[PDB]
Each structure stands twice: as C-alpha cells, then as structure tokens.
RNA sequence: CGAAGGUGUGCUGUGAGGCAUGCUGGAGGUAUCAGAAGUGCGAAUGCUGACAUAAGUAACGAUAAAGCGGGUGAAAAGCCCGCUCGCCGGAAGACCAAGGGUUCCUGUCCAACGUUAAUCGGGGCAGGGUGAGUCGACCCCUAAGGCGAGGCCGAAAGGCGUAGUCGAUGGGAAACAGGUUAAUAUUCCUGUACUUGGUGUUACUGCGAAGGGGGGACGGAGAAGGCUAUGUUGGCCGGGCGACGGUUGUCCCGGUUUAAGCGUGUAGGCUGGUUUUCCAGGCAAAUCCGGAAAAUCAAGGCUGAGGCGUGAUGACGAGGCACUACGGUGCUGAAGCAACAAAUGCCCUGCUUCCAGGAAAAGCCUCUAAGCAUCAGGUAACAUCAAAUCGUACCCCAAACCGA
RNA sequence: AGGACCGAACCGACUAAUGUUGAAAAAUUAGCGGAUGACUUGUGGCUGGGGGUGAAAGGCCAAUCAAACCGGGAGAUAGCU
RNA sequence: UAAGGUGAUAUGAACCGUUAUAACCGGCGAUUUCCGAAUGGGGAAACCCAGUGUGUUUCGACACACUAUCAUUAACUGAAUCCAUAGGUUAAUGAGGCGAACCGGGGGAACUGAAACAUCUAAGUACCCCGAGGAAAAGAAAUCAACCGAGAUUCCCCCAGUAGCGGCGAGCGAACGGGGAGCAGCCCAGAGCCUGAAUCAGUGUGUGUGUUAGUGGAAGCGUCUGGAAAGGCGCGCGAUACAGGGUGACAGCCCCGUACACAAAAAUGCACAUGCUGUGAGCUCGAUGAGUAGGGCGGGACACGUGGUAUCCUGUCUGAAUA
C-alpha cells in the first residue's frame, strides 16, 4: 500500500502522518501495555506505515 | 512543526503497581512510562494534549535496570524513566 | 503480555524450580 | 594495613581514562593496540 | 583449575657456615 | 548374518610382533611392494585433567552466652512470635563523604553457596521500590597543577610558555515542623515561607564595562562574658497503691515537644561623623577610593548570638475506647510551665599577644570613556511565568568498600 | 610562651606471649614514646628508572629494588645440571 | 527468484501472501541518536554549557544550518612613523585519524662470536618518528671495458666463498663479464617560421567484455538381509555432467550440485572508435645547470676498518675552468 499515497501532496501527506502518529499508535501502545491488545501485528504495520510516509515525505520535500 | 509528534512519542506506556494504585486513589496522580529524556515540560504538554486534563506538576525519576541472567549469560535490563504526573481536582484516567 | 519466557535446558546442578 | 589499591573513580578516570590516553600519542598507541587485540573493554570507564 | 600463582618465599635456611 | 577401539583366551616367531575368536560397539578399515615422518616414553624437582596418601585427622575462622514455650515445616537449638540471661553503647548506635551497583521490600524453592542442617539469607526465579527552584551534583570564579591560538627551542616525536580554557580539596541564592508505604522523603501530602531571572502595567530617573575603588579576604596560641543544643530537679496532667514486711504519701510510673520565615533588634564587637574647596595619584576620565585645608556636632553608622510575640484557639502528645486477614487499623486525646549546670556549637572571619607576617578570583555596592539620552536602560510597587538535567534504594568503622 | 609536663582520639611499633600449611603473605592482648607542633590527616596534583625521592638505611618507587613492571631483540649465551 | 515466510538461541500467540507491491538477494537512494580525527567551548567518553542567522500553537518555548586548527588563494580593514608592513575581519579548496605487511629517509642498540675482551662482528638487524603509493626508490652514465667493444633502472642464476677487507683472528665479501624477465624515451634552463601538429590529462556517445541477483540442466527398478539401504544378485539408461555435500548403512541415474548453454532495468572494472576543454608537433641558431667540481680538517656507504686507498655524501674554511 504505497501507490495510493505516492501521488498525494505534501499537506495531505503530513496530515495523514499526523493522524497515523496520533491514532493507532499512542492508543495502540497504551492498549499493548495494559494488555487489552489481542493482535500484535497492528503495531508493526502502523510503524511500517509511519516509516513509509516519512520516506515519501523525505523523497518529495527538498530533493 | 514536530512538537506534536515529539509529544506523542515521549509517552510510551502506563505503570501499574500497588504504589501506583495507592497514589491514584489518594493523591490523584498517575504514574506512567516516559521516554529516556522525557523532559518535564514536554511530558506536561503531552499529557495535556493527549489526556485533555489539567496537571499540577510533573516530577520524574530514572529507574536503573536490574542485572538478570538468562541461562548463564548476564543481561542487564534496559533503563527507563517514570513520571508522577499530578492531576487537578478533575480526573478522567 | 508475554508470559512464556522459555527457560533453556540448564546444567545438571540446576535449581529444582 | 591499607592495601595498595584504594579505589577512586575520579582519579582513575583522570589517570587512565580515554581522554587521558588520547591526550598523548603514547596513550593513543596503547588504544590502537587494544583495538587490534579486539578487547571488549577498550579502557577503564563506567 | 588455575595453578597456584603466588608461592611464598622459602623459610630462610638455618646457619650452616 | 558387524569395521575401528575396548576387553580375556589358544597358538605362533631368538624379538620388536602376528593370527583367530567369547562379549561391548556401531560404520569404517585395508592385503603385498614402495615413498615422508610431528614414527615407539619410565623418569627431565616436566606440562594439562582426574583419582589415592596422610584421613574420615586438624579445623569448622576472638572465651559477648543461650534456655524454655508456641507456630510453619517431613525434618527446628540456629526459620517467625513471647519471657527470661549476656554484650556494645564516644559504639558493636544513627547519619553521611569516597567506594560498590539493586545486595533494599514482597511472593516463591532448597538444584549450588553459608566451613554442619535449615523451612532461613546479603543464595536461585518473578514482581515492586530511588519523586527536589530550597539536598548535593550541574553552573559563575579560582589556588596547586594540566592543556594551550600565536611565540621560542628541538633530528622527527616533541619540551617550555602568553593570551585564553580547565581544574574543589575553597568562595556564590533560597525550607522548615508533623504524617505516610513492605521498601522514597528536608523530594510525596498538610501548614507556613523564601531566592534568582523573563514578560506586561504604574511613577521617577540618566544609563553603560574584559576598566577603577571597597568587599569578598583569611596565620599560630590564649582567657573572659552573653548564650544555645543539651541534661537535672520542682509544679501540672493521666494512671497506680501493687501477688515476700509497710507504702493516699515530702510516694512510684510516662509526658510536660513545638521548627524555618516575619517584627523588635538586646548582650557583645568595630569605627568619629555632616558639609564645602582643591589635587600631575588609581597605566585615559571619573560624582567612586586616596590625599591636602576649612565651618559644624559630638554623636552617628556597620556587625551582632540570644530572648520576646506571630508562625501556632494549628501539628504532636501519655492514656483510653471499638474492631483485628489476630501483624495490626479508626476515634478521642489533659498539662505542654519555673529554676539550675552547661558545653568542643553561635556572638567570634570576635578580643589580647607572637613571629613563623598569615591564598586568589567571582557574585555584591559604587564611578564613569566609547554610544545613545522623544530611545534604550535602571530604580520602587503590582500580576504571572520558569528554575531545566543528573543521584536520591541499600552497606557506608562493615558480611555489601580495599584485603583471593 | 614553651619543637613543655601527665594523659584520651590519632600516629609508630620498644618488650613478652600466641600465631609460622596462622583470624592475617608481619596479625592480636597488656605494657610502650609523641599527643600544639620538625605533628597528623581527607581531597586534588607535581618529581618516572641509571632515573625520581630519600632527617641517608643502598631505604621506598603498587605484597617485587645494589637498578620496577609490561612487550620486543630472544628459542640472548651457558665449556654447566 | 518466489509459495512460503515475520533472523537464531527456542517453542509459542497474532499475521502477510499464494500469480503476484507475501518473504529473500542485488543495483541505486533515503534515515543514520551519542562517544569516537569530534571539528562551537569544556570534559572523568557515550556527558555539561553556549553564540549567530533562518520560521513558528500562552511572552512562555521550540526546529533547522553554521560557529575547531593549520596551509594556500582572494577581498576589506589596519598600528608603533607619512607611505608601507606586521596584525585583524570575511569568502573558497586541501589535510588532520584509523589500518596486517612492502618502500625511502632521520635516528638507532644490546645479547652473542672471536672460546676472555676494547678494532670488528652481531648490525645498519631489533625498536621510535616522518611521506606517499598500490607497489615505492632508482632510472636514461660527468658508467664500464680495453685500447676489442655494450649503450636506462630494477630482479633471478653463474662468475663466487674467486679477487679482496679483516687484533690479516673471528668473520665480512665484491666488481667486469655471461645467460634470462621486461625494454620508452624525454622535459626546463630560449629566440624566429609554420602554429590543434603527434603524444597526454579532464568529460559524454557507441561497440566489446567482467562483476554486483540468477535460469535451464540427462539418465533404476525388482528382489535378500536388514530399524533404515545408497549394501549382496538380476537385468537397464545418461555422461561436453561419477569434481563435491546431504538423504534411517557406501547413490552416476533421491535432492542440491558439477560439464554445457544463457541472463542485466541500474551502477560498475578494462580494450577501441567517435565527440568537447587544457598543456602541447617539425624546422634554423645559441644555450647546456658556481659557491658547484676539488682541496684542508673528522666521519659514514661502497666487500674495502686509512692502509699505497680510488669513488660518493657529509659538520667547518677555502675554492677554479666552462668546452
């Protein structure tokens, strides 16, 4: 899942990055710590999505 | 502006223990895991933004990791910091 | 939560657990 | 009686610390020999 | 199984001169 | 349908050896002739691992000392609780500094350690525990000393050293009483305060230093006065009159604590002040220091423990009452005064003498040049903001630091 | 005032005893000398090997000193066992 | 390449994909905390404290880049004296350190041998410092030879334990010449004619070729022992593939492999053609390296130790000619 955001603009990409860092990351880690989390792949996939979005931002903005 | 994402990242997990429960029920304060640096101002801002509550003051401390042995291999636990954030009279969590 | 730590096979003079 | 070794972290660091070794080339050569021998503890440090 | 590193110096011999 | 190794046997050769096989083993070995040895062990006070010897012997690690009862447990002298006996008590008590890095508390086990057992531990596994604007580190300055831009010198390396920068063993701003957990507290909670700077308002004003002046800022020895921490007695509060004689009495038992900050500033110590005029001195100037003359009063000014009121009709408080996972928790809570003695601790970096002549800079008050003075900046009052980061467990004259 | 006197902490080890495969690779008990000065101690540095320091004994220089320790010449050489 | 995977100790739970964006490898990029030449200052290393300029939710406070040293060049300022210099400020390129050995140079021993030991040897070895490289140095005779002749340097074997040096003791030890590896000659010290004129250095295109991922790749069964057969016996096939590893005992035909044939979107090492920039062909003349050669004084290397002692260098004093 990369092409659906490869063509997005900087502002919307940053908004998506902020949304991903706020939701599904802080709540996910809190749930995992509290033990209410049942599936652990959520953290891995959200972290990989964050890394992918950061890479796209680095590639687009600047260079 | 990376202040928002820094505030998101500074907080790692909450802390649960008998002392934590006693402080929560008595002093209306919550103890939770924080980043290794986790400066007081950043912790206060992150708590304010995420928990949408009012905090009186934050005092932190660094916990030294214990030395444990798996098999015969010595293995020091990773160090971590905990912050005792004191909430206002109005508490949510 | 990760309860299982998978303690390895110990030496012959190992704690009885 | 008092033995030869009386520990003192500050004195140890200022006498045999990494900065003390690197101040002069001889200590730098000692560090190079340590690296070549591949010792995990390159020098005295906390 | 290390060999004894330090061995005390022998007791001085009795004067046989 | 059993190679090598191991293990006994019968033959065989003057011999180093050779042949076959009983059993283990489990998958490699190798006829004859040639080629090279890291080619043959019984010693070298030989090297590595193991096992005997002494020998089930010394010893079981200051002659401060254990007993009984109950409890858990399979097992109790050493593990938990109660009553007795003993030791330190200028320590064998409590804090720390340096030094260790979780040994601190709980649950859980006796695999290994404790010079014995152990249910126990500073032992094995799991969990919890270290909260700072007022503690210290951090940070400003600096002594001894280190580094050292340029610079000098030296075959190279490198040695010395200026400006500068480090370097606490020192100098700089601020918090105290009570309570709390199984483990944190001068950090958390209750009460009362304080210190340094940013921001904005109000009224004034000239501001401004790597520069100048004072301060910081100091040795030895010795005695007195005020005191305080501290301890003794008396009165007061609550309880007791008591198993071997008497004990309502001038008798016995426990308490009679209250900080920092705020105002007065005392005992004591230091010094003569107010004003005017002038000076190539303070590597430039100076209202600041120093010096030179005047009129005036004779006191002023600085430092200064302690005590006193507030802090505080607040906390604490002997003891009693009600429930106890029977370890313990909740409520209540009277008096909280006088005198004496007194320190090595404060006045005291004090005072008097002595030669052995007794650190430096920074913060701090003040002065102005450069520049600006409708600004900027400073002063006095108010409101708010921030004071970050690091250690806070535990041992710290010892079972935890240096001695294996 | 005393490089004063007696005597605690502190410093050192003059005598005796025990301990020599000891509690300790110089220790413990009682005596013993100084204990206001040439005293001692905590902390931080300076003096580095034919050199340092030395109230000077050939003493100390990390339990080793008439020339420390570490690595190299180096498997120095040994007419010796 | 791909239908199995989220690395191992060391299983699990939760998942992705299964015809392609599951997983893995490769080429090119991005991120790359702190200490570490650390490079803003300091410092006991993974730590503390700053200034400048760029933009921002409560002034609060934040994110980014720079601020080390030296060398060279350039610009602006700038004293003791006018000029001027030294110095000061700013801009640009390079180095600073690490790394096993090889090279050259500046230093540089001792033990031991001579049956002792000082000349000597050990030895220009042990070891320190400096500089660059993939090799470095050297290198085209002010050389030899002998009056016959060879034409750069380096390395291998003879000459050769020869001649020689040597308390003529121990020991050290050549050269000429011969056979081989490989051979490239030039540039400055200067004028005129002709002036891209060959050979090089710096960048693109094309062709060739190798790497960084890889693909295909032949051929055996039945019977007996036997835990298991690749082993006993029978009959077969491949081989430009029985070189190797694993498979319940020794497998050519069980799998990975090997012989053999191919693959490259992208970056690459090397051989040529084709492009662009810089130094730069050939002809006539002259010039042809002065504080040098040499000598005196004391030494070092040449096998050669001062001996009858040539040659080169060196600390000091002198010192010509130039064809």
Coordinates of N, CA, C and O (backbone and C1' of nucleotides) in Angstrom, one line a residue, chain F residues 155, chain G residues 71-76, chain H residues 101-111 122-129:
Chain F
rA155 P 68.7 20.0 17.1 O5' 68.3 18.6 16.3 C5' 66.9 18.3 16.1 C4' 66.7 17.6 14.8 C3' 65.3 17.1 14.6 O3' 64.4 18.0 14.1 C1' 66.9 15.4 14.1
Chain G
rG71 P 54.8 -9.3 29.2 O5' 55.2 -8.8 27.8 C5' 54.2 -8.8 26.7 C4' 54.8 -8.1 25.5 C3' 56.1 -8.6 24.9 O3' 55.9 -9.7 24.0 C1' 56.2 -6.2 25.1
rG72 P 57.1 -10.6 23.6 O5' 58.1 -9.6 22.8 C5' 57.8 -9.3 21.4 C4' 58.9 -8.5 20.8 C3' 60.3 -9.1 20.8 O3' 60.5 -10.0 19.6 C1' 60.5 -6.9 21.6
rG73 P 61.5 -11.2 19.7 O5' 62.9 -10.5 19.6 C5' 63.4 -9.9 18.4 C4' 64.8 -9.3 18.6 C3' 65.9 -10.2 19.1 O3' 66.5 -10.9 18.0 C1' 65.9 -8.2 20.4
rA74 P 66.7 -12.5 18.2 O5' 65.4 -13.0 18.9 C5' 65.1 -14.4 19.0 C4' 64.5 -14.8 20.4 C3' 63.3 -14.0 20.7 O3' 62.4 -14.8 21.5 C1' 65.0 -13.6 22.3
rG75 P 61.5 -15.9 20.9 O5' 62.1 -17.3 21.5 C5' 62.6 -17.3 22.8 C4' 63.7 -18.3 23.0 C3' 65.0 -17.9 22.2 O3' 66.1 -18.4 22.9 C1' 64.2 -20.0 21.4
rA76 P 66.6 -17.6 24.2 O5' 68.0 -16.9 23.8 C5' 68.0 -16.1 22.6 C4' 69.2 -15.2 22.6 C3' 70.6 -15.9 22.9 O3' 71.1 -16.5 21.8 C1' 70.3 -13.9 24.2
Chain H
rA101 P 52.5 -4.7 10.6 O5' 53.1 -5.1 9.2 C5' 53.8 -6.4 9.0 C4' 53.9 -6.8 7.6 C3' 54.9 -5.9 6.8 O3' 56.2 -6.3 6.9 C1' 52.8 -6.3 5.6
rC102 P 57.4 -5.2 6.5 O5' 57.1 -5.0 4.9 C5' 57.6 -6.0 4.0 C4' 57.5 -5.4 2.6 C3' 58.4 -4.2 2.4 O3' 59.7 -4.4 2.1 C1' 56.2 -3.9 1.4
rC103 P 60.8 -3.3 2.5 O5' 60.4 -2.1 1.6 C5' 60.6 -2.1 0.2 C4' 60.5 -0.7 -0.4 C3' 61.4 0.3 0.2 O3' 62.7 0.2 -0.4 C1' 59.3 1.3 0.1
rG104 P 64.0 0.4 0.5 O5' 64.1 2.0 0.7 C5' 64.3 2.9 -0.4 C4' 64.2 4.3 -0.1 C3' 65.0 4.8 1.2 O3' 66.4 5.0 1.0 C1' 62.8 5.6 1.3
rG105 P 67.4 4.9 2.2 O5' 67.1 6.2 3.0 C5' 67.3 7.5 2.5 C4' 66.6 8.5 3.3 C3' 67.2 8.6 4.7 O3' 68.4 9.4 4.8 C1' 64.8 8.7 4.8
rG106 P 69.3 9.4 6.1 O5' 68.4 10.0 7.2 C5' 68.2 11.4 7.3 C4' 67.7 11.8 8.7 C3' 68.5 11.1 9.9 O3' 69.7 11.8 10.2 C1' 66.2 10.9 10.2
rG107 P 70.9 11.1 10.9 O5' 70.4 10.9 12.4 C5' 70.7 9.7 13.1 C4' 69.7 9.5 14.2 C3' 70.0 8.4 15.2 O3' 70.9 8.8 16.2 C1' 67.8 8.1 14.5
rG108 P 72.3 8.0 16.4 O5' 71.7 6.5 16.8 C5' 70.8 6.4 17.9 C4' 70.1 5.0 17.9 C3' 71.1 3.8 17.7 O3' 71.8 3.5 18.8 C1' 69.2 3.6 16.3
rA109 P 73.4 3.4 18.7 O5' 73.7 2.0 18.1 C5' 74.1 0.9 18.8 C4' 73.1 0.6 20.0 C3' 73.4 -0.7 20.8 O3' 74.4 -0.5 21.7 C1' 71.1 -0.6 20.2
rA110 P 75.7 -1.4 21.7 O5' 75.4 -2.6 22.7 C5' 74.9 -2.4 24.0 C4' 73.8 -3.3 24.4 C3' 74.2 -4.8 24.4 O3' 74.8 -5.2 25.6 C1' 72.2 -4.5 23.2
rC111 P 76.0 -6.2 25.6 O5' 75.3 -7.6 25.3 C5' 74.4 -8.1 26.3 C4' 73.6 -9.3 25.8 C3' 74.5 -10.5 25.4 O3' 74.9 -11.3 26.5 C1' 72.9 -10.1 23.7
rA122 P 77.4 -7.7 11.1 O5' 76.3 -8.2 12.1 C5' 76.1 -9.6 12.3 C4' 75.7 -9.9 13.8 C3' 74.6 -9.1 14.4 O3' 73.3 -9.6 14.1 C1' 76.4 -9.0 15.8
rA123 P 72.2 -8.7 13.3 O5' 73.1 -7.9 12.2 C5' 72.4 -7.3 11.1 C4' 72.9 -5.9 10.9 C3' 74.4 -5.7 10.5 O3' 74.6 -4.6 9.6 C1' 74.0 -4.6 12.5
rG124 P 74.9 -4.9 8.1 O5' 74.7 -3.5 7.4 C5' 73.4 -2.9 7.1 C4' 72.6 -2.8 8.3 C3' 71.2 -2.0 8.1 O3' 70.2 -2.6 9.0 C1' 72.5 -0.9 9.7
rU125 P 68.7 -2.7 8.5 O5' 68.1 -3.8 9.4 C5' 68.0 -5.2 9.0 C4' 68.0 -6.1 10.2 C3' 67.0 -5.7 11.3 O3' 65.7 -6.0 11.1 C1' 69.1 -6.3 12.2
rA126 P 64.5 -5.2 11.7 O5' 64.7 -5.3 13.3 C5' 64.5 -6.6 13.9 C4' 64.6 -6.5 15.4 C3' 63.7 -5.5 16.1 O3' 62.4 -5.9 16.2 C1' 65.9 -5.3 17.0
rC127 P 61.2 -5.1 15.6 O5' 61.2 -3.7 16.4 C5' 60.7 -3.6 17.7 C4' 61.1 -2.2 18.3 C3' 60.5 -1.0 17.5 O3' 59.1 -0.7 17.9 C1' 62.8 -0.6 18.0
rC128 P 58.3 0.4 17.0 O5' 59.0 1.7 17.4 C5' 58.7 2.4 18.6 C4' 59.1 3.9 18.6 C3' 58.5 4.7 17.4 O3' 57.2 5.2 17.7 C1' 60.8 5.1 17.6
rC129 P 56.2 5.6 16.5 O5' 57.0 6.8 15.8 C5' 57.0 8.1 16.4 C4' 57.7 9.1 15.6 C3' 57.1 9.3 14.2 O3' 56.0 10.2 14.2 C1' 59.5 9.1 14.0

